[PDB]
Design a protein around this ligand. Structure first.
Ligand SMILES: CO[C@@]1(c2cccc(-c3cn(C)c4cnc(NC(N)=O)cc34)n2)CCOC1
Length: 263
């Protein structure tokens, strides 16, 4: 343990202060903190080496990319038996939580801005041949709200947490319909994730299949059922192209981004 062949900044525990609990991610508890910067501390549960390795791989890869719409990763701290990823605090938190609270008065124009910013971030990851693997409204963080007159939203995509490759079948099923179908048993999976996230954003933060059970979610992919049409009709062609069960038929993010700018 503590791989020694990945590149990430090692944060000393004397440099971080842990403040309030914010929520949970997959096998993590996340806390507001300070880095002597306003940060978020993502404390991994006591885990087997394989899970910790997938956590450190995310930290290393997200430490070496840069983009206007990607949240910073500052490093990893080992505080006793706890691996803690130190990441950027994004002022207004997860998009899906805010959208549900503000449901009914978030205009379509606002959602198209967000879609375009997200597509831009994924276009960059595609060009670098890097998989995110956890594109969803929860992992879209709002840096600027953009509802007030003369303003516009600004989002940052959070890190994917513990790498998808290390997660259990039951955790993968919990991620339906954001999870690409081929992942239930490549950067193409993030096209599906993006498409599902557009449905979520259009539905003001309510994802399709939310009221279903794990077994029913798994059934949905098993029988290759069709996901719903978005409530922004101008996105219906785009979402249908991304939410295709065959991965090679999904369009590239260069095409997605171009199409969004014309919509
Ligand atoms: C987005 O999923 C996580 C999560 C869950 C619930 C709340 C927040 C969350 C609430 N607030 C106010 C934040 C401010 N900044 C960030 N920053 C970064 N880099 O995620 C996250 C949050 N995060 C779970 C896995 O990781 C974070």
């Amino acid at each position: 343990r503590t791989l020694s062949q990945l590149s990430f900044h090692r944060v000393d525990q004397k440099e971080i202060t842990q403040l309030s609990h914010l929520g949970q991610g997959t096998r993590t508890n996340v806390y507001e903190g300070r880095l002597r910067l306003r940060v978020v501390l993502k404390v991994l549960d006591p885990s087997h080496h394989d899970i910790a390795l997938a956590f450190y791989e995310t930290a290393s890869l997200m430490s070496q990319v840069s983009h206007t719409h990607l949240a910073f990763v500052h490093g990893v701290c080992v505080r006793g038996p706890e691996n803690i990823m130190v990441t950027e605090y994004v002022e207004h938190g997860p998009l899906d939580v805010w959208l549900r609270r503000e449901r009914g008065h978030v205009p379509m124009a606002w959602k198209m801005v967000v879609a375009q910013q997200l597509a831009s971030a994924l276009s960059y990851l595609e060009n670098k041949n890097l998989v995110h693997g956890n594109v969803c409204g929860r992992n879209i963080l709002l840096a600027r709200l953009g509802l007030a007159e003369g303003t516009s939203p600004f989002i940052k995509l959070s890190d994917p947490g513990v790498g998808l490759g290390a997660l259990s079948r039951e955790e993968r099923v919990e991620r339906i319909p954001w999870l690409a179908p081929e992942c239930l048993p490549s950067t193409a999976m993030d096209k599906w994730g993006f498409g599902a996230t557009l449905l979520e954003i259009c539905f003001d933060g309510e994802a399709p299949l939310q009221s279903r059970s794990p077994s029913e979610k798994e059934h949905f992919y098993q029988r290759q059922h069709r996901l719903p049409e978005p409530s922004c009709p101008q996105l219906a062609t785009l979402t249908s192209q991304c939410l295709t069960y065959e991965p090679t038929q999904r369009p590239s993010f260069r095409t997605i981004l171009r199409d969004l700018t014309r919509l």
